[PDB]
Design a protein around this ligand. Structure first.
Ligand SMILES: O=c1ccn([C@H]2C[C@H](O)[C@@H](COP(=O)(O)NP(=O)(O)OP(=O)(O)O)O2)c(=O)[nH]1
Ligand SMILES: [Mg+2]
Ligand SMILES: [Mg+2]
Ligand SMILES: [Mg+2]
Lengths: 131, 140
């Protein structure tokens, strides 16, 4: 009926490979955070490589097609994957946090407007521990 | 009637700031590539800073509560925001690309693990075909 969100996809992935994936916000052991840092560094370095390749081809006068974006699109999705993966392994619903960051950002795009409240992610962590 | 995805939220944001973005994959100018990279680096460094700080408190012997995770969760959401931001400015359906990367990643389940926990690829694993997703999106 409705496809899963990318965050729920990460929960399915971690369940399938036997990786920790708690239901509610859970303080992690150091080994988890180190790995999440390592995955983030690997995939952001691959994103950077594809942007450089595209910049170099443009500098040599190449006319990029839509097909030429496939490697960059692949790596930006890998970055999403490891970014969602960090939140999932922390037991933190990424959609709930994103929805609050988006509400703040979108709200700030009016006028910094009157009564603008920044993102309250701590309050999101609280509401997530009671559901 | 399916609720909005986070990729669809970025299209709403870019529209609301009048920088509205293409609906189909669209090669970008160089300045747009360099701008997205800057935003990636800035939020990546903010995420790296929060990870280092939680690791430093744990190393120091301090016990994290769930509420201690909010600065890191916040920066991880920011990094999603500018990563989805880049795909939207390229006219590329992030959800369509992600679904194909996800399919490829589920097939890794029988493979070994690296010492640090990273899932590695089983024998005969086949990569995602994101070129196929771009071609699909481009000819919609
Ligand atoms: O433990 C893992 C392993 C992989 N992944 C996902 C993230 C990303 O979608 C992809 C990255 O895994 P690899 O680094 O093994 N493959 P990649 O496509 O990045 O090729 P390479 O790293 O060799 O350039 O698999 C996880 O989420 N957790
Ligand atoms: Mg990799
Ligand atoms: Mg990659
Ligand atoms: Mg930030």
């Amino acid at each position: 009926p409705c496809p899963p969100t990318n965050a729920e996809r990460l929960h399915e992935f971690h369940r399938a490979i036997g990786a920790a994936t708690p239901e509610r916000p859970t303080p992690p052991p150091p080994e988890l955070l180190r790995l999440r840092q390592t995955l983030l560094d690997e995939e952001s370095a691959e994103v950077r490589a594809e942007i450089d390749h595209l910049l170099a081809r443009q500098a040599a006068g190449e006319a990029l097609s839509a097909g030429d974006l496939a490697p960059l699109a692949h790596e930006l999705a890998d970055l999403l994957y490891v970014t969602y993966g960090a939140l999932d392994q922390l037991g933190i619903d990424a959609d709930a946090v994103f929805a609050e960051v988006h509400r703040a950002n979108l709200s700030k795009a009016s006028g910094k407007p009157e009564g603008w409240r920044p993102a309250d992610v701590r309050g999101v962590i609280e509401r997530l521990q009671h559901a």
